[PDB]
């Protein structure tokens, strides 16, 4: 039917608008935002700590630095690099060379349907072992907080301070899993799926949000430093969005024709 798309508004019609027919009855409400994002998906795979760690230093990190890489998981669907917020998402097509291969993550599913600018929800976290008969624990600190390093000595054994604290620590049974829900805890009101600002007035990276996350989790072995092993253990981190809400329509990623 006659219209003018230049207006910026085009009404959705049906078979009977210009032709002869009727409306098809509604088949489902699966496009409902709350229902759609309310399901677990893989966020990242991290190594399990077997001693107190040294949190990765800020960028740019110079050669010779002593730190633990691939252990901390930033809870966010946004791109991350080496446990920190990121803008560009990267991977390694040529894993051959010199230098540490930074861990990167991205909620692929989230962005394939994130046709909006802002998002908010509580976060259900599930940690699954990728190792046989593993006994591990999970640690977590809020957005804006940090990992408490070092350790204390009990009976000449070094026990990392990450065994204690005021934040959630979940000890799984041998071969078991860990699961719990966290509240939106960032100081921001909503999470910017895409962002155009800057978190600092000087030497800031445009588009890089400072606290677009639900905090950080890590996994460790309920054993003292001394009883350390040599074989690196891995654990998978799953997240689920509870009571999700979204604002300001936006685009979905470009699909190549090649």
């Amino acid at each position: 039917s006659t219209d003018n798309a230049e207006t910026g508004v085009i009404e959705a019609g049906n078979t009977d608008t210009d032709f002869s027919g009727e409306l098809a009855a509604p088949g489902s409400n699966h496009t409902n935002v709350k229902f759609l994002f309310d399901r677990s998906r893989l966020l990242n795979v991290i190594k399990v700590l077997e001693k107190d760690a040294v949190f990765p230093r800020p960028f740019p990190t110079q050669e010779g630095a002593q730190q633990d890489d691939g252990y901390f998981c930033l809870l966010t669907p946004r791109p991350t690099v080496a446990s920190r917020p990121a803008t560009r998402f990267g991977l390694y097509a040529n894993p051959s060379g010199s230098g540490v291969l930074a861990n990167t993550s991205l909620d692929f599913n989230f962005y394939s349907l994130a046709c909006f600018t802002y998002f908010r929800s509580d976060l259900e976290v599930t940690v699954v072992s990728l190792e046989p008969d593993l006994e591990f624990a999970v640690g977590w600190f809020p957005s804006g907080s940090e990992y408490q390093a070092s350790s204390f000595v009990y009976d000449q054994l070094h026990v990392p301070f990450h065994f204690t604290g005021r934040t959630p620590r979940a000890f799984a049974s041998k071969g078991g899993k860990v699961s719990f829900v966290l509240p939106w805890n960032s100081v921001s009101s909503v999470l910017p799926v895409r962002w155009g600002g800057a978190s600092k007035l000087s030497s800031a990276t445009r588009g890089l949000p400072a606290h677009a996350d639900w905090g950080t989790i890590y996994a460790f072995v309920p054993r003292p430093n001394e009883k350390k092993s040599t074989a690196v253990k891995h654990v998978a981190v799953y997240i689920r969005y509870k009571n999700a809400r979204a604002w300001c329509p936006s685009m979905l990623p470009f699909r190549s024709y090649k």
């Binding site: 608008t17 032709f19 088949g27 489902s28 699966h30 998402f89 599913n109 962005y111 990623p253």
Partner: protein, 118 residues
Amino acid sequence: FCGPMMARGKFLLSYSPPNGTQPQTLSEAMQCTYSIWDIGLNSSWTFVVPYISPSDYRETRAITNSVYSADGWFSLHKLTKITLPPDCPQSPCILFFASAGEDYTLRLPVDCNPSYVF
């Protein structure tokens, strides 16, 4: 229509449900669901593709070609050639948009295709 305002012309938009062979001729298109669009003051024309299916739901992805995942074709024919006055650009362009009709519904969330990141 994004040609000049002095332009005139008519188009025939048609939708054909599945057939053994895809229609090509104006005579064939004209026998399916169609509407004739006249170029003039108003620049646009919306065309609703009726939902004509054997099943109450249809496949979103044509993994295998069937009457449940492929529902025919939409085609645009120029009915009467575009007429322009002297000193007017030739070959006017027609912008195409697609959207869900008011009774459009989606069912069963599936895994995403992560390739947009490669």
